[PDB]
């Protein structure tokens, strides 16, 4: 068992469903789908070294810009301490510290 041999296949025109979790994209083509999957398969070495943030990017520039959001404005800011937070729940629960 050393030799080998492979080959494609064909069948009626059916609806193909992306074998990816969450994804809701479909296509009635085997060629178009493969091209789409390319998006799911890749690599994201660049990681946001921010507190709380656990996202990642592929392009260096992409990240840089994203980071700006942290080094700028925040969708969550306290009143008393006037601090900034990434998550909402944290802010709500945080208040406790202020009050009794
Ligand atoms: Zn997909
Ligand atoms: Zn981030
Ligand atoms: Zn506060």
UniProtKB/Swiss-Prot annotation:
Parent sequence residues shown: 365 to 457 of 457
Keyword annotations: Activator, DNA-binding, Isopeptide bond, Metal-binding, Nucleus, Repeat, Transcription, Transcription regulation, Ubl conjugation, Zinc, Zinc-finger
GO CC annotation terms, alphabetical: chromatin; Golgi apparatus; intracellular membrane-bounded organelle; nucleoplasm; transcription regulator complex
Disulphide-bridged cysteine pairs: none
Role summary: Transcription factor that binds to GC box promoter elements. Activates the transcription of these genes.
Subunit relationships: Interacts with WWP1. Interacts with ANP32B; this interaction induces promoter region-specific histone incorporation and inhibition of histone acetylation by ANP32B.
Maturation and modification: Ubiquitinated. Polyubiquitination involves WWP1 and leads to proteasomal degradation of this protein. Deubiquitinated by ATXN3L.
Free-text domain note: The 9aaTAD motif is a transactivation domain present in a large number of yeast and animal transcription factors.
Subcellular location: Nucleus
Main subcellular localisation: nucleus
Single GO MF annotation: DNA-binding transcription factor activity, RNA polymerase II-specific
Assigned protein family: Belongs to the krueppel C2H2-type zinc-finger protein family.
Protein name, UniProt field: Krueppel-like factor 5
Lineage: Eukaryota, Metazoa, Chordata, Craniata, Vertebrata
GO BP terms in the entry: angiogenesis; cellular response to leukemia inhibitory factor; cellular response to peptide; intestinal epithelial cell development; microvillus assembly; myotube differentiation involved in skeletal muscle regeneration; negative regulation of transcription by RNA polymerase II; positive regulation of cell population proliferation
Tissue expression profile of the protein: Expressed only in testis and placenta.
KW tRNA-binding (keyword) present: no
Zn finger spans (C2H2-type): 16-40, 46-70, 76-98
Keyword set includes Cell division: no
Annotated gene: KLF5
Organism of derivation: Homo sapiens (Human)
């Amino acid at each position: 068992g050393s030799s080998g041999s492979s080959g494609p296949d064909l069948e009626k025109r059916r609806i193909h469903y992306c074998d990816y979790p969450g994804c809701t994209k479909v296509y009635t083509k085997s060629s178009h789908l493969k091209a789409h999957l390319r998006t799911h398969t890749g690599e994201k070495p660049y990681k946001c070294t921010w507190e709380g943030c656990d996202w990642r990017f592929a392009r260096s520039d992409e990240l840089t810009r994203h980071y700006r959001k942290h080094t700028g404005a925040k969708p969550f800011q306290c009143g008393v301490c006037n601090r900034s937070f990434s998550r909402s729940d944290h802010l709500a629960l945080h208040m406790k510290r202020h009050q009794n």
